[PDB]
Amino acid sequence: ATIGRISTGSKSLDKLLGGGIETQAITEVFGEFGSGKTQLAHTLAVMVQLPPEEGGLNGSVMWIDTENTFRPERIREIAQNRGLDPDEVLKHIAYARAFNSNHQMLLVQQAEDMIKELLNTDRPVKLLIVDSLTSHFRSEYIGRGALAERQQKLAKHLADLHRLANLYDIAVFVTNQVQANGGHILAHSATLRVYLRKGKGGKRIARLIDGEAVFSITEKGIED
Numbered sequence: 001a002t003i004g005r006i007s008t009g010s011k012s013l014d015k016l017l018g019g020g021i022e023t024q025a026i027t028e029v030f031g032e033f034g035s036g037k038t039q040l041a042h043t044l045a046v047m048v049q050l051p052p053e054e055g056g057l058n059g060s061v062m063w064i065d066t067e068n069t070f071r072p073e074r075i076r077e078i079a080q081n082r083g084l085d086p087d088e089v090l091k092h093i094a095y096a097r098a099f100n101s102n103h104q105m106l107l108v109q110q111a112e113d114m115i116k117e118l119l120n121t122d123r124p125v126k127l128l129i130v131d132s133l134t135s136h137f138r139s140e141y142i143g144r145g146a147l148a149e150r151q152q153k154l155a156k157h158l159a160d161l162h163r164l165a166n167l168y169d170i171a172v173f174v175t176n177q178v179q180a181n182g183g184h185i186l187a188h189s190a191t192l193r194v195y196l197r198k199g200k201g202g203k204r205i206a207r208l209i210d211g212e213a214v215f216s217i218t219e220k221g222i223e224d
């Protein structure tokens with residue numbers, strides 16, 4: 001397949017990305033609590049359902065939640081203000097809550113069955129979200145003695161996600177909380193790393209790790 005691109009809602013961030021987030025890739029966004037990673041995830045789940053003339057891919061969505069942070073009312077607000085029907089948008093998002101890190105690993109395997117089901121329809125899966133990818137692993141494996149086991153399990157989970165992205169032409173989008181009092185970047189595993197932070201007057205600022213884009217959080221999700 002050719003490489004597909006999903007607009008983020010912001011022309012500034014799209015330019016930084018070369019057009020938007022790519023299919024056949026894992027995109028990792030990281031930053032402090034409150035920086036807006038989950039608002040970017042909600043915006044993409046709506047943007048992907050637009051036609052290509054408007055920056056979408058006529059796609060279906062699959063969402064794995066680890067912290068109870070998905071909000072259908074927020075999805076309805078973004079859709080209504082992007083000219084789509086809110087009921088139709090929610091109908092094409094498949095949602096599951098991960099109980100712990102082992103169950104989170106099984107949910108990715110289960111996702112592959114719905115992906116095959118939709119593959120030859122007019123609304124195939126084009127976006128897979130994991131928010132938050134690291135939270136269960138961090139709280140379950142504490143200490144230096146337990147680090148090697150935590151890294152083993154994380155490495156396998158990332159390889160599972162890479163396989164789905166490439167075999168089925170899907171954009172994988174994952175969030176990771178990193179601050180002074182805890183949190184670790186996924187080293188070199190994702191295809192692309194994006195650093196997110198809050199600036200003066202509630203502007204959000206993004207930079208590619210290995211110029212900068214600037215945007216706001218609004219009724220449209222995010223915009224310049």
Ligand SMILES: Oc1ccc2[nH]ccc2c1
Pocket residue numbers: 062063064094095096107108110111114
């Ligand atoms: O069977 C399902 C339904 C929704 C999902 N979201 C993520 C995995 C998954 C599996």
